[PDB]
Design an enzyme around this catalytic site. Structure first.
Site, PDB file in Angstrom:
ATOM      1  N   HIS A  48       3.503 -65.595  -7.549  1.00 19.89           N
ATOM      2  CA  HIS A  48       2.710 -65.486  -6.329  1.00 19.89           C
ATOM      3  C   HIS A  48       1.357 -64.879  -6.675  1.00 19.89           C
ATOM      4  CE1 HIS A  48       5.336 -66.764  -3.134  1.00 19.89           C
ATOM      5  NE2 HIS A  48       6.308 -65.950  -3.507  1.00 19.89           N
ATOM      6  N   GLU A  62      14.652 -71.231  -6.994  1.00 17.73           N
ATOM      7  CA  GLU A  62      13.826 -70.158  -7.528  1.00 17.73           C
ATOM      8  C   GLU A  62      14.660 -68.886  -7.641  1.00 17.73           C
ATOM      9  OE1 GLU A  62      11.103 -67.940  -4.922  1.00 17.73           O
ATOM     10  OE2 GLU A  62      11.092 -69.709  -3.624  1.00 17.73           O
ATOM     11  N   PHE A  84       2.474 -70.423  -4.703  1.00 16.99           N
ATOM     12  CA  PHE A  84       2.689 -70.099  -6.110  1.00 16.99           C
ATOM     13  C   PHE A  84       1.690 -70.792  -7.034  1.00 16.99           C
ATOM     14  CE2 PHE A  84       7.003 -69.730  -4.276  1.00 16.99           C
ATOM     15  CZ  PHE A  84       7.468 -68.544  -4.835  1.00 16.99           C
ATOM     16  N   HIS A 137      17.640 -69.521  -4.221  1.00 14.16           N
ATOM     17  CA  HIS A 137      17.655 -70.458  -3.109  1.00 14.16           C
ATOM     18  C   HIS A 137      16.785 -71.651  -3.465  1.00 14.16           C
ATOM     19  CE1 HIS A 137      13.577 -69.746  -1.634  1.00 14.16           C
ATOM     20  NE2 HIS A 137      13.785 -68.443  -1.668  1.00 14.16           N
ATOM     21  N   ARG A 161       8.871 -65.849 -10.646  1.00 13.07           N
ATOM     22  CA  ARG A 161      10.121 -66.598 -10.499  1.00 13.07           C
ATOM     23  C   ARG A 161      10.353 -67.640 -11.589  1.00 13.07           C
ATOM     24  NH1 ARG A 161       9.817 -63.214  -7.147  1.00 13.07           N
ATOM     25  NH2 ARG A 161       9.868 -63.389  -4.862  1.00 13.07           N
ATOM     26  N   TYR A 191      18.271 -64.864  -2.912  1.00 15.01           N
ATOM     27  CA  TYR A 191      18.079 -65.536  -4.191  1.00 15.01           C
ATOM     28  C   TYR A 191      19.414 -65.692  -4.912  1.00 15.01           C
ATOM     29  CZ  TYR A 191      13.108 -64.710  -3.515  1.00 15.01           C
ATOM     30  OH  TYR A 191      11.834 -64.705  -2.990  1.00 15.01           O
TER      31      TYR A 191
HETATM   32  N1  LIG Z   1       5.615 -71.474  -1.531  1.00 10.11           N
HETATM   33  C1  LIG Z   1       6.781 -72.101  -1.449  1.00 10.11           C
HETATM   34  N2  LIG Z   1       7.769 -71.640  -0.664  1.00 10.11           N
HETATM   35  C2  LIG Z   1       8.929 -72.362  -0.741  1.00 10.11           C
HETATM   36  C3  LIG Z   1       9.143 -73.470  -1.525  1.00 10.11           C
HETATM   37  N3  LIG Z   1      10.442 -73.956  -1.367  1.00 10.11           N
HETATM   38  C4  LIG Z   1      10.982 -73.155  -0.502  1.00 10.11           C
HETATM   39  N4  LIG Z   1      10.142 -72.159  -0.053  1.00 10.11           N
HETATM   40  C5  LIG Z   1      10.525 -71.221   1.045  1.00 10.11           C
HETATM   41  O1  LIG Z   1       9.881 -71.739   2.238  1.00 10.11           O
HETATM   42  C6  LIG Z   1       9.412 -70.664   3.094  1.00 10.11           C
HETATM   43  C7  LIG Z   1       7.841 -70.760   3.234  1.00 10.11           C
HETATM   44  O2  LIG Z   1       7.037 -70.721   2.035  1.00 10.11           O
HETATM   45  C8  LIG Z   1       9.939 -69.367   2.438  1.00 10.11           C
HETATM   46  O3  LIG Z   1      11.242 -69.082   2.995  1.00 10.11           O
HETATM   47  C9  LIG Z   1      10.028 -69.792   0.951  1.00 10.11           C
HETATM   48  O4  LIG Z   1      10.917 -68.995   0.134  1.00 10.11           O
HETATM   49  P1  LIG Z   1      10.307 -67.832  -0.828  1.00 10.11           P
HETATM   50  O5  LIG Z   1       9.459 -66.983   0.053  1.00 10.11           O
HETATM   51  O6  LIG Z   1      11.534 -67.158  -1.321  1.00 10.11           O
HETATM   52  O7  LIG Z   1       9.549 -68.523  -1.893  1.00 10.11           O
HETATM   53  C10 LIG Z   1       8.080 -73.955  -2.339  1.00 10.11           C
HETATM   54  O8  LIG Z   1       8.119 -74.960  -3.041  1.00 10.11           O
HETATM   55  N5  LIG Z   1       6.918 -73.209  -2.250  1.00 10.11           N
END
Ligand SMILES: Nc1nc2c(ncn2[C@@H]2O[C@H](CO)[C@@H](O)[C@H]2OP(=O)(O)O)c(=O)[nH]1
EC number: 4.6.1.24
Length: 104
Positions: A92, A58, A100, A40, A77, A38
């Site tokens: 989450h 986020e 989310f 990212h 986040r 993070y």
């Molecule tokens: N749920 C969700 N995951 C995201 C999104 N953009 C990037 N991700 C990333 O895509 C992968 C699958 O969800 C994870 O590595 C996640 O990171 P995070 O787990 O940090 O959210 C988004 O818009 N929604």
């Protein structure tokens, strides 16, 4: 009241601002922390109603109040863009899988 209600956690205007500012700065310096690197890119798969332009990033906002430093990020986040505009506050908690929901 509670400005942003995430699951059962409550964040104020300055809480989000403080967290966002921390994440935005690391973003500017190309730095990341935590097992999930993070801040990212947040691609917005949930299709949230963001009124500010992408790209989005986020960053964990902690119920405790500390600025995230690579430890346990929790479920909440803040999402910001390259202009450091707050896109929204998501969590989450209340969502299934790695999805989310927006804190209200
Ligand atoms: N749920 C969700 N995951 C995201 C999104 N953009 C990037 N991700 C990333 O895509 C992968 C699958 O969800 C994870 O590595 C996640 O990171 P995070 O787990 O940090 O959210 C988004 O818009 N929604």
């Amino acid at each position: 009241a509670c400005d942003y209600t995430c699951g059962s956690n409550c964040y104020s205007s300055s809480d989000v601002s403080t967290a966002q500012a921390a994440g935005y700065k690391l973003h500017e310096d190309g730095e990341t922390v935590g097992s999930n690197s993070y801040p990212h890119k947040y691609n917005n798969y949930e299709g949230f109603d963001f009124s500010v332009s992408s790209p989005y990033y986020e960053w964990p906002i902690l119920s405790s109040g500390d600025v995230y430093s690579g430890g346990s990020p929790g479920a909440d986040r803040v999402v910001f863009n390259e202009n450091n505009q707050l896109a929204g506050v998501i969590t989450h908690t209340g969502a299934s899988g790695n999805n989310f929901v927006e804190c209200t």
